[PDB]
Design a protein around this ligand. Structure first.
Ligand code: CA
Ligand code: ZN
Lengths: 262, 217, 217
DNA sequence: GCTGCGAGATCCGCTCC
DNA sequence: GGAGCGGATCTCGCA
C-alpha cells in the first residue's frame, strides 16, 4: 500500500503503464494509480466502470448497446421509444443493477433535454458528451455491433420473438465467451468489484484533511523535523508524503510524525 | 445454495413480479403487462442473462404448466420443482420482502412522476439502501458468494504442482554427480529440502546446485 | 535522562550562554564575548570538560549551523539536534529559567563588583540554598543521574530468568486474538507489560488475558 | 602390425584405546 | 565417544 508507491511511480516512469495495470500489479489503490497516471507529463502530452452507449436497430426494433471499456461487458434491453422519458427510464434502469462512474455518448435528440442533465446530477455519475473522432473508438464500436448481431440468427428459429433473442445474445456473449483461464466478462466485472470495494474501508475514515510533520532518517540520524506536508494515504504504521526538494514520494513510520491542529 | 423464488403482487390494477433469493436475499421487480406465457418466458431468460442460478423453486401458475415452458427450461438446463412450498422460512422471507417493498414504494410516491422510472428507482433504493450484516448490500453478498465459490473451486491449481528436482553435494572439496531425479518436499528461499535414497535421510540443498524438472510420466 | 538545552540571553549588552537541564534542573550560565562559531565551539568544549552530556537541544542560530561546527559535533559523538523547537514544554522551561535567573541576578549585583563573580555567586547561592521535597538540591539529582550511568550496570540484566507468553487485546469487553508469541518484559501483580512489533509501542495486558508458555521439560 | 602417466594433496570410514 | 590411519579421488603437465 504505502510502501510500494515509489516503486509503482518509477516503474510507470520507465514504461508508461496504465492505472489498471499498476493496480493489478503493485496492489496500490485505484485512486493512487489514477493519480499517478494523470500526473504524468508525457501521458498528459480504458478503465473499469467506464461504459459507452451507441444506437442500433434490427428488424425495425429499438435496442440499446452498452459496451464496457475494460471488462468487455455488453448489456441490452428492449426500448419502446426513443423519447427522452423512455431514454431516461433505460439509463437509470441500467444503474439499477450496475454502479459505474463514467459514461460517454454522442449527440442525440434524447441525449440533451432540460430535465436530462438535472436527473443525472442527482445520480452523481459523471457523464461526458462528445464526438468520437478517435479511429480507435470508430473501429472498436464497429466490431461490437457485428459480434452482438451475428449471434441473433443462431437461435431465432426456436425462440418466439426478438426480445427472446435479446437474452440469447447476452447468454452467448457474457456467459460462454471466455479468455485467459476460462474467465467470463461477468467474472471479470465481479472480481473487479471485489478490489473496488476495499478502498471504501480506508477512505471512510480518511475524509478529513490533516497536516503533519515528517522527519527524514539518514544512516540512523534523525536530523530534524520538516514540513508541513499533506498526508496522502494512511497505512498500518506507514505514511507516504511528498518531498518538496527531491520531488519524490517518501515513506515514514508512525513514530516520526505529530499532529498539527487546524 | 443458489435458490430462487418468484412471487407476484397486485397494486393499482397492475401486476409486479418479484424475484427473491433465499440464502442471500436478492430482490428484483418488474412490471408484468399481461398474463400470457410469452412475458414470463422473456422475463425468465432475461433473468438468466443477468443472473447465474443453480436452483429455482416456484408455485403453480396458469402458464407455468405448459409443455413448451418445460422444454424451454430444460433447454436452459435449469431445474424446477412443482408443489406449494412447506418451509415457513421461505414464506416469512417472501412476506417480509413484499411488505418492505410495498412500504418503500408507497413512501416514495411523491418523489417521482413517471411509472417505469418509479419502478426502477424503487429497485435502486431497495437493492442499495438495504444494509445487512456489516453494511453489505444483497448484490454485495451475492458477489461475495460468487467470488468465494470461484476461489474455492480454483484453489486446487496451486496445490497440484509436485515439481521434481535434481541435487548434488560437495565431497572432498569437489562437486559430486547429479543425483536424481527426485521429488522436492519443501522449497523456500535460499534452499530446498529433499529425500535421499542412498541413506534415507532428509537433506537441505541451496539453490546454487539444483535443477528443476517437471514430473515424469 | 540527562536532557540539556543551550540558549543565549542578553543583559546590559552582555551575551550569556545558559544550559538548562530537565532531570537535575541545574542551570549553568557563563559569559561569552561573541556568538561566533569558534567561540561557541570553545564554550561547548569547556562545558564538556566537567560534564558528559547525552541529549542536547538547540534553537535557531547562525553559529549553530556550520560545516566545521557539525564536524566538531560528530567529533563529540553526542546525540544532539539543531532546528526550531516548537515544543511548548522546552520553550516554557527555558523562558521560566530565564525569568528566574533574571530575577535572581539583580539581588547580588551591588556587593560583587565583577560581573562574572556576581553571576557565579548568584548561581552558587541558588544551588546551595534552594531545595525541594525533603531537601533535594539540583547537584544531588545530577550526581544521581551520573551514577545511574555506570558501564558495569548494563551487564547485570539477566541472571537466570527468561519467560514467554501470549497476549490478547480487549475493546470494551470484547477480546481479540493471541497475536502470536512475544517476549516478556517484567512480571507485575495483576498485569504484565509487553512490546508490540507492529507499532513498537509498549502495552499492558491483564493476567487473565495472558496465556503462559510452560518452561521446557 | 601398438599403446598415458603419477606425485602431491585432502578428506571419510574405519577401529582401537 | 576421542583418536590415528589406509585408501579412493582429484587435477595438471610433462612431450
Ligand atoms: Ca620428449
Ligand atoms: Zn506516464
Amino acid at each position: 500500500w504505502i510502501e510500494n508507491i515509489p516503486l509503482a511511480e518509477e516503474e510507470h516512469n520507465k514504461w508508461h503503464q496504465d492505472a489498471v495495470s499498476l493496480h493489478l500489479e503493485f496492489g496500490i489503490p485505484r485512486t493512487a494509480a489514477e493519480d499517478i497516471v494523470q500526473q504524468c507529463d508525457v501521458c498528459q502530452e480504458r478503465g473499469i466502470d467506464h461504459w459507452q452507449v451507441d444506437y442500433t436497430h434490427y428488424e425495425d426494433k429499438i435496442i440499446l448497446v452498452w459496451v464496457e471499456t475494460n471488462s468487455g461487458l455488453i448489456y441490452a434491453e428492449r426500448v419502446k421509444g426513443e423519447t427522452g422519458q423512455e431514454f431516461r427510464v433505460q439509463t437509470m434502469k441500467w444503474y439499477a443493477m450496475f454502479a459505474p462512474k463514467s459514461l460517454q455518448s454522442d449527440n442525440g435528440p434524447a441525449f440533451v433535454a432540460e430535465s436530462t442533465q438535472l436527473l443525472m446530477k442527482y445520480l452523481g455519475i459523471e457523464h461526458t458528451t462528445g464526438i468520437p473522432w478517435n479511429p480507435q473508438s470508430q473501429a472498436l464500436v464497429e466490431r461490437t455491433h457485428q459480434t452482438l448481431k451475428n449471434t441473433l440468427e443462431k437461435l431465432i428459429p426456436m425462440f418466439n420473438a426478438f426480445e427472446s433473442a435479446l437474452a440469447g445474445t447476452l447468454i452467448t456473449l457474457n456467459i460462454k465467451r471466455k479468455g485467459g483461464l476460462g474467465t467470463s466478462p461477468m467474472d471479470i466485472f465481479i472480481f473487479n468489484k471485489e478490489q473496488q470495494r476495499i478502498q471504501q474501508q480506508s477512505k471512510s475514515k480518511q475524509e478529513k484533511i490533516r497536516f503533519c510533520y515528517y522527519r527524514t532518517r539518514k544512516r540512523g540520524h534523525p536530523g530534524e523535523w520538516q514540513g508541513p506536508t499533506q498526508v496522502l494515504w494512511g497505512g498500518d504504521g506507514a505514511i507516504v508524503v511528498k518531498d518538496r526538494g527531491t520531488d519524490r514520494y517518501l515513506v515514514i513510520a508512525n513514530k516520526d510524525v505529530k499532529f498539527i491542529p487546524p
